[PDB]
């Protein structure tokens, strides 16, 4: 059984980062070095494992998290980073065991006049716990005045559109990200290398 990684990396549609997609991988065999030797990835950073030693290890679960962010923000997808994305959208733990993979997707995810589709959370009353996901759209009450369900004075809709325009510089260009994490628990380790 080949693990269904091609459905993760080559999915036609990718999640907004605030509603990041998480796919559980199990009971299958995976060849990770083929990913490492792909030449289409402009980012491939692992933590707590070596990209080479991945094919000789087994785990209870592999998680594949995927989403779109802008190029300037790929650096926030790592343990111990700060910024709007790390704090409010997708947070990796300090002891993160896995790999962060990203690639420019300007050809697919930019649209002339702007892309409305991809969103990020700009306001939150607190930082996310690691691997926490928050899809709420309640108006952010920045002050003491009640918002009554509508943006306004000190009342902010919490999600913002990236507006990926094809002519942007790379830092403002969309990047598709896939984060693999590896979980070993007492339950059987069913996802293994070749």
């Amino acid at each position, epitope marked *: 059984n080949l693990c269904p990684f091609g459905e993760v990396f080559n999915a036609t549609r990718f999640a907004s980062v605030y509603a990041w997609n998480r796919k559980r991988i199990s009971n299958c065999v995976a060849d990770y070095s083929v990913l490492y030797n792909s030449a289409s990835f402009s980012t491939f950073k692992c933590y707590g494992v070596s990209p080479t030693k991945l094919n000789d290890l087994c785990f*209870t*679960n592999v998680y594949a998290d995927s989403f779109v962010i802008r190029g300037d923000e790929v650096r926030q997808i790592a343990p111990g980073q700060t910024g709007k994305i790390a704090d409010y959208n997708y947070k990796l733990p300090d002891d993160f065991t896995g790999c962060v993979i990203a690639w420019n997707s300007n050809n697919l995810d930019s649209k002339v006049g702007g892309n409305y589709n991809y969103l990020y959370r700009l306001f939150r009353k607190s930082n996310l716990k690691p691997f926490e*996901r928050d899809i709420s759209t309640e108006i952010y009450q920045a002050g003491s005045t009640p918002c009554n369900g509508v943006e306004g004075f000190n009342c902010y809709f919490p999600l913002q559109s990236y507006g990926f325009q094809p002519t942007n510089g790379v830092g403002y260009q969309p990047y598709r990200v896939v984060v693999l994490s590896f979980e070993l*628990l007492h339950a059987p380790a069913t996802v293994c290398g070749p």
Partner: antibody
Amino acid sequence: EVQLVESGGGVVQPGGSLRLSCAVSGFTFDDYAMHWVRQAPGKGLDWVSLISGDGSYTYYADSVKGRFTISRDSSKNSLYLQMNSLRTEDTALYYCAKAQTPTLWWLQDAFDIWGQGTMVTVSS
Amino acid sequence: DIQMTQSPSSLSASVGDRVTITCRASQSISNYLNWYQQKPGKAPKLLIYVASSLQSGVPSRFSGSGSGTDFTLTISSLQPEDFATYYCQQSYSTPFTFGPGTKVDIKR
């Protein structure tokens, strides 16, 4: 066989306190998120609270946030719900439930085994 | 909160009937939707998880389908042990929410 056994329910006065326990056997407790789900008399199912396997993440229904506290004791294979400032509408059978997947995450999963519940009756 | 509805609220059926009941989420929950079955005086039992996977020990006459907002539970030939109330539940986002249940009782 996996077993969950709730205790601690009884008749409390509005504003009172009560602690619920859930004793578990037959699986590696720490590998699994655990949940409290309650059922008002003649009503449907109502999710109350969760706690991840290592106890580091918890979540509450809005109706009980700030009044209830969930916690687990690995040494005693036990789950607790500390219920403060109880209201009449908290009256329900309280089930504890184990998440199906062994994982430190807590979303996108199912509750594969339920205890038979303990009755909480809040009345003046 | 993601609101879950179910239809019909109650259903009369006979042994051997084909039964289809539905569940709707107020917003997309992908396929992160579970079905539980509950009989009076007893705790719910997990029947279907992640929209279409049958729990161990659930027989093949049960199936589940749907992804996004609309889900269905189908029992191809209702058996006596299937008379019960059925609840759907979204796991996509906290707080978790349940549909209000569909009771399937015995036609006579």
